[PDB]
Amino acid sequence: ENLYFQSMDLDHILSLAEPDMLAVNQLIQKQVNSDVSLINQLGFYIVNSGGKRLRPLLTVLAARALNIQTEQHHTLAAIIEFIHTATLLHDDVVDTANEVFGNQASVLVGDFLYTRSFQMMVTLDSMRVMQILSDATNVIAEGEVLQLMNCNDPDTTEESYMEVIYSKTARLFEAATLLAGVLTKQSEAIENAMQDYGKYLGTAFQLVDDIMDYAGDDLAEGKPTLPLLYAMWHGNEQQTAIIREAIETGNGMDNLTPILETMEQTGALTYTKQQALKASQQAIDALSPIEESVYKEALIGLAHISVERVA
Amino acid sequence: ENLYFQSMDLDHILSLAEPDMLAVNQLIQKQVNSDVSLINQLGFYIVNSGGKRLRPLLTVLAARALNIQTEQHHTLAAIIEFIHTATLLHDDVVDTANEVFGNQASVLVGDFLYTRSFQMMVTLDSMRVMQILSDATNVIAEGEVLQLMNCNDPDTTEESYMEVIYSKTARLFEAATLLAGVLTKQSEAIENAMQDYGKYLGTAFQLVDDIMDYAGDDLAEGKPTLPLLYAMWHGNEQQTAIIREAIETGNGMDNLTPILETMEQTGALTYTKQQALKASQQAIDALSPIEESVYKEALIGLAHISVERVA
Ligand SMILES: O=C(O)CCCC(=O)O
Numbered sequence A, B: 001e002n003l004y005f006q007s008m009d010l011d012h013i014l015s016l017a018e019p020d021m022l023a024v025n026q027l028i029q030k031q032v033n034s035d036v037s038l039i040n041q042l043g044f045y046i047v048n049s050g051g052k053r054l055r056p057l058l059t060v061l062a063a064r065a066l067n068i069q070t071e072q073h074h075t076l077a078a079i080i081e082f083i084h085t086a087t088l089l090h091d092d093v094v095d096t097a098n099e100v101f102g103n104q105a106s107v108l109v110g111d112f113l114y115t116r117s118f119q120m121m122v123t124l125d126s127m128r129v130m131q132i133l134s135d136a137t138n139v140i141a142e143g144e145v146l147q148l149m150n151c152n153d154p155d156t157t158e159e160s161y162m163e164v165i166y167s168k169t170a171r172l173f174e175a176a177t178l179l180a181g182v183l184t185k186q187s188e189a190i191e192n193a194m195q196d197y198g199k200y201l202g203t204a205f206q207l208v209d210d211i212m213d214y215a216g217d218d219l220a221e222g223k224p225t226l227p228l229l230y231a232m233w234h235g236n237e238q239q240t241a242i243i244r245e246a247i248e249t250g251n252g253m254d255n256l257t258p259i260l261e262t263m264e265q266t267g268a269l270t271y272t273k274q275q276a277l278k279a280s281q282q283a284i285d286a287l288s289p290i291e292e293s294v295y296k297e298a299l300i301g302l303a304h305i306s307v308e309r310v311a
């Protein structure tokens, strides 16, 4: 009887969003602009298709699900993607544009994007927007530093890993969806609903990323992600010691297959997949208060799509 | 007859400002804080005496010259110094905390300070403050990129050099003094007066810095500053070619004394000193509309002090 039993697939999501996404991409091009040639060249290299990405998609779908009557979500989407791009540039120094243009330029163009995003925020003329994004971006910075601290630390806890995911990835998604609610003057209940959707969706996406690494860039650098940690926690004495050493010394690739084996035997990747599935469902469940629309259906489909590669 | 004929000296300026400056330094300590250990350690290393510096001094003197009735200038001073410190950290990558803690951490803690400064701005509850500082910080980023472009470029013009000084140094001073006017709800005329004071003061300070380099860190890196450029422009054919090559190749120290000689013969350092003197006087002249007070006298003394080492 239910003709719309299937969740919305990616092609339909992307077709639905396309007019908004192309408008975001155009705004990003016009906003990347400065008189300074190097900014324009590095900018082109890193953000020429910036409006055609996941965080802008989320943002425009959220705003349309909330019946936005302006084009302020195009500005918001560009802000969010500039924050993401600035973060990426800076993270690749501390670990690409920095390989191509140097650490220095990548840092400074990161700052150019970052500061420009705040200038765009000011055009929205909302102190609440500034509060939300200044809080979010400070959290991101803290999360990136916490991540850098955890590197080579085999005593990293599950809670600390999850705090890194939350701060460095999920918080920006959470802000984007909350801000769609702010711009459209929604109730506290609806704002909370959208905030939770973003937070959990972003969590799902990062968990899946960490799974797909092993399904070993992280291994190489001594990065303690959940699959590697969980394998260490549940492995036999020799397995645990191999992984501890890999984390401390970065020599994991010399024991690549034994480590991958430990992950299989302990169900470490499975456990991480379970956490991703949970986040995805929590995101979907958060949208209960939201009015039905094709944009709501797209947000639900995105949550399904986030964990598709993992089932 | 005039018992106060002498401009206020540095000891009197610093004594007058000390209660405010110690309050700024305390706020900076409390605001540097996070749960993340590395932020607290790098933070301590770079900003533990941040409230005892030139930009906070300027800011608190400006606000008191405008009869501020709150302590919002302590927040402003901390914001300005966080912006400066974040910039410095980032600039030292692209060229110290990065030598000590690594490029990566220095970049990210820079971002922590930067984003925290915006969170502090939000506490001032003024959209105009956010507009001014988002504009200023984007200008700084652009200026830092323009500087990086000019490096090793012997065709850099005087106008381009001055644009770098204006964007990378003077604009932040200009914002600080303008913002003292914004916080104390001054007229447009008084705001303009304070803005100009900061702009010209910051210009003076940077010119003096560039003079004092030669009075050869810049030489080493192919940096085209006014003294080196002017020497090239006015030197004989052999002198000009030596300096052109030094800029392009960074081999200037192999011709250290001939270059220094060219600067002497051409009056290149003198010409730059003349520009610094001019900026200093323009700053003093901008304060004409400001009500008399000991804080006004301190601002005037600071402008004199800026160029003292050069006369
Ligand atoms: O509701 C707020 O104003 C706080 C925003 C923090 C966030 O959830 O992203």
Ligand SMILES: O=C(O)CCCC(=O)O
Pocket: B128, B131, B132, B135, B136, B171, B174, B175, B178, B195
């Ligand atoms: O007056 C304004 O609102 C613009 C501030 C730019 C500046 O002079 O620093």
